[PDB]
Every structure is written in C-alpha cells, then in structure tokens.
Write a protein that binds this ligand. Structure first.
Ligand code: SF4
Ligand code: SF4
Lengths: 154, 158
C-alpha cells in the first residue's frame, strides 16, 4: 500500500519527491512528468510503483540537474525541484510545514536566491537530520535518500 | 522479504570489499558467524534494508553501522570468520587472487597492492571504487563502507 511510505517520505525523501508522494496520496493520480520522477526514484530505492497504486519490492533515476533543468512544471504538475521551481513565499511555507526553524529557513532562502539549489537541499538535509556538516556533495535525489538512511538507521 | 540472491548483483556493483565478501560467504555457506552477521547485518541496516534468518531474507526497514576504522582496527577475523577489511586482513597473495577474480586489471592490481603495502587500506579501497566505476577519481575520502555504497549508487545513477 502506497501509504506504507508516508513516514519514510517525511523523514528521508528530498523535497522534490516528498511532494510527489504527498500529491499521489491526495489526488490518487499523477501526470506523466511526475510519474517518471517519483516512479524512478522509488525504483532507485528498491521498490516498485504500480497502479489504486501499490508498492512492492522489485530505468535510470533522475538527477538533480535533470530535474532542475528539463521540463518545468505547469499547474496540475507536481514534479520538478522545489528549490528552483517553487515560488519563494510558498517555499517558506513548505519549509514551515516541515518544522524547520526560521534560522535555517533564512539561510536556505539565501541559497535559493543565489541559485544554489543543491546546497540549499544540502542545508535542508542538515536541518532535518540535525547535522552541522552533511558530508557529501549532492547531485541526485537517490543520494539524498541513502545519505539520509545512513543517519537514521545509525 | 525478498530472497538474498535478489541483491546478488548489487553486491558486485556497489558493495565494498568487506561487504561483497560477506555476501558471498552467506550465500555460499548459509550462515555467518557473529562478526560477519554484525558487520554485514548492520551495513544492510544502514541501507535501510533488514536481513532476517527465518532461509535468509531481507526487506525494507520502513547498534551502529561499522566504520572503516572500526572494522579495520577492531575485531580481526579468525579462520571461521569471513569479516573485517580485506585490504587489511587478507594476505596479499589471496587478495591478489581475489582481486583478479573480480575482474580488475594488472594495472589496478598493481596499484592497489602498493597501497596495501603502504598500509593505506582505505585508499586501497578507493582504487577499487574507481576501477569498478571506470572513474579517474572517486571524489571523496572514504570512511564508511556505507558511504562507499551511496557514492557508488550515485554513479550508476548518473
Ligand atoms: S535539490 Fe536535488 S534533491 Fe534536493 S530537492 Fe531539489 S532536486 Fe530533489
Ligand atoms: S576499506 Fe572500508 S570499505 Fe573498502 S573494504 Fe576495507 S572496509 Fe570495506
């Protein structure tokens, strides 16, 4: 059942995925663009997404620069990266729904405006995971996943 | 819980030499001893998977995973054991046959060995990473088998 990963997406998914997850639950559907981003991200974590959707243990996953550059999202479309594609004022609100302190939120917000999205994600990661220095140069959402899974089951 | 051979290929692809080695032995002998269960069991947990011995199974997860230094400087392997760092705990003659078995070329085997000679086992392992991914430079400083994992997955990813 798709819902089995609610908490997993909260805790360890990137913003770009966690949104697609939230979306899928709430609209019981996804357009093309967002089926491939979240579907192949799931693949990347050893899990399959199939249609009334379900997940089961088991095609190149999407990179933060494939997401950031190609195919920006129309309305209805819930795919793309929120550091880049989200409008800032709403971005502050999403960061706010995630219980991220204003300090971080500010810092991040500076990075977005610097067009430093991946470093912003990086900052975020530090914040949800409570680490001062994350330790890895981020370029792929599957890397966000395992770099998170490490801290959690650590 | 899928079956273990379900990640038989992933171990060649993305597990370090200490984990790839524990996989073999678990699939081959059907058991592992303590230090090999813990090393291998905890590494997998670090991935978010969970090995179980009902017949061995692994599933998703939805004790602290061992560092390179933990493994290398603590709990050396007895004969009944298949754990620890290979670059550190293997005779180099056997490492040399193990590394051949994994399809690394002479130039790779040569460099790796020199490093082992210098007692630079972790860098001996970066050589392995780069060789397996056909990269000129791994990019990071290695500290954790689990970091080797994620870094590797990231290459195969793109
Ligand atoms: S940065 Fe890369 S990973 Fe972090 S959210 Fe934007 S896309 Fe997903
Ligand atoms: S170096 Fe760290 S990773 Fe490479 S083998 Fe020895 S322990 Fe496993």
């Amino acid at each position: 059942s798709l819902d089995q990963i609610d908490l997993l997406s909260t805790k360890s998914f990137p913003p770009c995925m966690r949104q697609l997850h939230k979306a899928l639950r709430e609209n019981h559907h996804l357009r093309h663009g967002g089926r491939m981003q979240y579907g192949l991200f799931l693949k990347g974590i050893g899990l399959t997404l199939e249609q009334s959707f379900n997940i089961r243990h088991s095609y190149t996953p999407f990179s933060c620069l494939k997401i950031i550059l190609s195919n920006p999202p129309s309305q209805g479309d819930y795919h793309g990266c929120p550091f880049r594609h989200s409008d800032p004022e709403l971005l502050k609100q999403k960061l706010q729904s995630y219980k991220i302190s204003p300090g971080g939120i500010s810092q991040i917000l500076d990075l977005v405006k610097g067009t430093h999205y991946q470093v912003a994600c990086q900052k975020y990661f530090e914040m949800i995971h409570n680490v001062d220095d994350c330790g890895f140069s981020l370029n792929h959402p599957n890397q966000f996943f395992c770099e998170s899974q490490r801290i959690l089951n650590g």
